[PDB]
């Protein structure tokens with residue numbers, strides 16, 4: 622089944638994500654190369670939705686320069702009815718590559734963490750706060766992770782409120798610190814193999830736990846202390862307390878050997 626984007630033509634290998642009025646497809650060009658293509662349908666001109674999407678393209682466009690830990694965008698076409706974005710295709714998302722795994726190599730867990738921070742630092746410099754980070758939002762492309770999205774649009778899910786931080790639940794304000802927390806949970810889950818409450822099931826309880834000063838988060842012993850320190854510093858409950866992405870970038874855990 623064909624597709625046209627700026628008069629270049631694309632044959633769909635398959636759908637790889639869906640949500641709202643948009644679908645993502647793995648696809649091939651004329652010269653047998655792979656790409657993802659996000660196709661959004663504007664027939665439902667929910668006007669908040671529509672500006673959310675014009676805003677995502679705008680940013681995705683601007684962050685092409687400042688980092689390649691950010692998914693590449695080769696082209697797009699937008700009209701009143703549709704939006705096609707032709708992007709990079711990753712081998713695999715992170716959320717998967719983790720569930721098909723028992724032991725993560727410590728060196729990889731570090732290199733993925735670096736990549737994580739770099740990408741999140743990049744979007745903070747441009748004043749974006751994701752506030753929705755989870756493993757799905759990252760993506761493997763030749764050893765490097767790359768952030769796929771910014772939290773601008775009511776995002777797809779491939780084909781969970783573990784990573785929800787405290788401030789987002791009491792506040793019913795969002796700073797950068799909010800992404801740190803979710804990053805911690807993602808690192809947490811990469812060391813221990815469960816987010817910090819994959820084991821509470823009562824949702825009313827789970828969010829009382831996320832916000833209960835007197836619930837001591839269980840921090841096991843591990844081969845490397847630095848990691849353990851990074852993890853405690855990220856999963857603090859006062860944002861004013863919590864470590865920053867710039868402090869995180871100058872941490873021993875990311876800098877030494």
Ligand SMILES: COc1ccc(Oc2cc(NCCC(F)(F)F)c3ncc(-c4ccc(C(=O)NC5CC5)c(C)c4)n3n2)c(F)c1F
Nearest residue numbers: 638647657659710711712714757758769770776777778779
């Ligand atoms: C939360 O929304 C998601 C939706 C779909 C997702 O899955 C995937 C899986 C991929 N692996 C492809 C390899 C395969 F399966 F074909 F073998 C892949 N490659 C490029 C993109 C991709 C690219 C761009 C965007 C995107 O729209 N980002 C916004 C424009 C900023 C999305 C959601 C996924 N994806 N996306 C995902 F991980 C999400 F987090």
